[PDB]
Amino acid sequence: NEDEFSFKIRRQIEKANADYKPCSSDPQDSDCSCHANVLKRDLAPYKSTGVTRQMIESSARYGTKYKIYGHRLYRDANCMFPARCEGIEHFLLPLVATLPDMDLIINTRDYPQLNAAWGNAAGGPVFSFSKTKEYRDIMYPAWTFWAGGPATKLHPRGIGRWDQMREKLEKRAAAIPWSQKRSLGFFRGSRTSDERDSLILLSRRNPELVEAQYTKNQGWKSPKDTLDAPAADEVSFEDHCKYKYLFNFRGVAASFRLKHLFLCKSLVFHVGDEWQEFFYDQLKPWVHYVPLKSYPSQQEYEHILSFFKKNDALAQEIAQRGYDFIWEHLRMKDIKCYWRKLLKRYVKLLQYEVKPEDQLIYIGP
């Protein structure tokens, strides 16, 4: 029973690692190619026809209009999420001097907007942080790499400053080496998706295997939102690092939690394979993390944790590779260069002339 399970997983590991090619020829990825597959795929559906002014005007209703016009940034007066706009503008602004004219419909909402099961009213192009195959949205690096992520008690201005977070988690991972970390599954987060429920219920049944509890978010309504338990306290990112086995789940769309877990040098269990950020394509199951299908059972959790607990070196190897991947290929420079490369390739698709719009406010620089 335990043996059939082991064979399957080790089989999946060996197969994954043998087929694994690094995302760039050298670790420095000098020409910003690591995540290029994603930006190619996202832009591809526009490659032949290109982008009509009508398409831009058609899509404006799905996000915040940004305009680069003659090395200045213009935007709708009304940002739906101002702190998210701030995050995005941190990256746009330094590129605006060296970049041609373009209109950008940037959706700052959690969920993507262009359902490819609708259309062609959902033809785009619209930029979103997160998508699945169901959506035509073009992924961009989320605002939170600089600013405007979820506001919590420990981060009242919004989770941001990924540059600073990298250094803080690097220090903490060095401080709590593999053999020191607790041998328990850990999760602390809110009920943004019921995919999260079985881990929390397992934790309650078996706290000695899993420490997982629901916090309260700002959308709280009934005690159902914590499955009838008192809301737990927030736990800092750096305090996640004292657990070997860290769980990540989708929320409304992808979660900003994921990237943080890797920098703990803990083993990451990533649940579901649908919801993406731009950098997930290069995170490989079994190479950088343990994949679990959506809606894991309590029995699945028991089997997988039991396996890695009895196969420690294998656990630490995967953890170490995930750490290294995020360390080396999710630097600020990777974020900045992805942005640059995406905008350059996109502007080439426009089949119209970008002209000023007086109702837009000047952003910078």
């Binding site: 940002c79 739906m80 999420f81 101002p82 702190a83 701030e86 909402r109 959690d110 405007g148 979820p150 506001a151 919590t152 009242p156 201005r157 919004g158 809110s190 943004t192 978010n217 700002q218 959308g219 929320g251 409304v252």
Partner: protein, 39 residues
């Protein structure tokens, strides 16, 4: 709507979901749509 779930209200603010958008209640000292500005 479910906009409030991602905690869009900064600096101790609280959130209410409409059907369309959302709205922040900001504590005295903070201002703006997301409580991001100093009062």
């Amino acid at each position: 709507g479910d906009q409030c779930e991602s905690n869009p209200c900064l600096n101790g603010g609280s959130c209410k979901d409409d059907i369309n958008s959302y709205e922040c209640w900001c504590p005295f000292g903070f201002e703006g749509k997301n409580c991001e500005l100093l009062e």
